[PDB]
Amino acid sequence: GVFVDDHLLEKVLELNAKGEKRLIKTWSRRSTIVPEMVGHTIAVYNGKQHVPVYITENMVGHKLGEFAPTRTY
């Protein structure tokens, strides 16, 4: 059905419970955004490219890119 990183939510679930709007990082594969990203800077990290973009309540349901770019950059 719906996919989601089984971890980027562990660090955000606390922020959503504490009230802190820090930036969460990811290290899996198809890192996807979820409703819990309503007010957080999903600034993932790995070692090269970055995938930030502060998701809101409408920017959720997609991503930033790179994993299927018919283009690049």
Place this chain on the structure above:
Amino acid sequence: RRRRAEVRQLQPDLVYGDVLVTAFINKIMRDGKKNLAARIFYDACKIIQEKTGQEPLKVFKQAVENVKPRMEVSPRRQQSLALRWLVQAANQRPERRAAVRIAHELMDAAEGKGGAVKKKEDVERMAE
């Protein structure tokens, strides 16, 4: 080269008993479907007999005969050339049906007139 190769020889069609018939059907032939082009000719002839009352065979042979260029001509090329204009001229006719355009193109050609016959007069006149 040499041996003069061959050109093969086919049989009649059905209600006409002539070789030039199928040969002409080969011109109207397109996409490799002779079955279609076949009926297109038969139906084209049916319209002739239903509009002139004359034999659709005597009108066909005569038409092609009034197209075979004398100058520009081997007794064979006279056929290949004639069959060309007969199809090209019939390809540029007002009638919407293929069998109808050809039918008219044949009648006019048999009467010494039309676009196909007009083309010949030009080739010959521009050759003499």
Place this chain on the structure above:
RNA sequence: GUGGUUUAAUUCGCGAAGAACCUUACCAGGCCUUGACAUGCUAGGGAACCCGGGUGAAAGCCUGGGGUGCCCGCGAGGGAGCCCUAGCACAGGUGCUGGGCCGUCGUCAGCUCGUGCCGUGAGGUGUUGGGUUAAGUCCCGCAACGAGCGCAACCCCCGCCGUUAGUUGCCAGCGGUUCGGCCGGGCACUCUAACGGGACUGCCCGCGAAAGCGGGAGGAAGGAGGGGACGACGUCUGGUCAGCAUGGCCCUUACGGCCUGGGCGACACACGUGCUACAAUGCCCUACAAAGCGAUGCCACCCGGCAACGGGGAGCUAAUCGCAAAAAGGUGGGCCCAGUUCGGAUUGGGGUCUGCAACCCGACCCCAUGAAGCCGGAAUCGCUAGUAAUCGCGGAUCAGCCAUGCCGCGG
């Protein structure tokens, strides 16, 4: 794909690499004895290994319990297989250039050798002529004579005949009709496989160097039966790291090794090649035809749905020992517009799926979408036989994950 753009924008001199998760490219990080994996050896200590938690998504590192066999052997030590640590070479390197292997290009016939002669410096004579011609050198005559380049040129496949075998595709006479299949019986027939026979220079005529070719009859494919396949040497002196090996340099063990994550070979302009695309097609309905290659994968078959897909049961190791792909293009009939012809790329919105996911590269369906009803002057490309060409089909996409690569056949 090339030039070019560019944080590197795969590699090499149109295409393939069989399908850009992926190695080759970049940044960052960890380890670097073992060096992701494997083989061999030395030194000290030490008994492999198994189960599991957290950190963790670089798997690095940290911790607990149990903890194999053999001789000397009796309560505990050495040593070997084995583990850890320490060291080294092979290892590893699409990191490059300069034998050999595979293969392409000139694709069709010609070249080479021995004896002898001319005859000397050598070379040539072994095609002078005629007709027919892509490999057992086309043959004959005249020529000095002869031979080889190596059993595939019919060796294999399709079309002819005969014989044998296999029988859910099949079938003449006959009965039961199980409501259309079908059963019983059936070297006859049709299909597949195996072997041999027919195979062009034979019967007759014309010229005859009788070398040969041409025409006709019998037969009927036959003097071309079609295709696959193929030569000293030369050239690209490459490519080839698909495989293997040598030498120089690099590899100094921190891109001087290796591993993972993430990404990249998208596009603005232009060319070359291929595919779909209106003027005669589309839509709907009934419905007999076509071969070859498949497959524990596919998957006929009730119901639900536009489709995809989904729920349940059964069948399979194989087509004359189930079956799927059925259907089907085509063809026939009717019909809507006297240029959206309803062909329809692409982009965009929603939903769904194999798959971890692919949500921005996939695929199917629905609405919109009209580049638009054009089909090209100089020049140029492919093919000519039941070929070109038109159209549809099927398997694997056997060299991995639904993103028209190849081969086979019929009309």
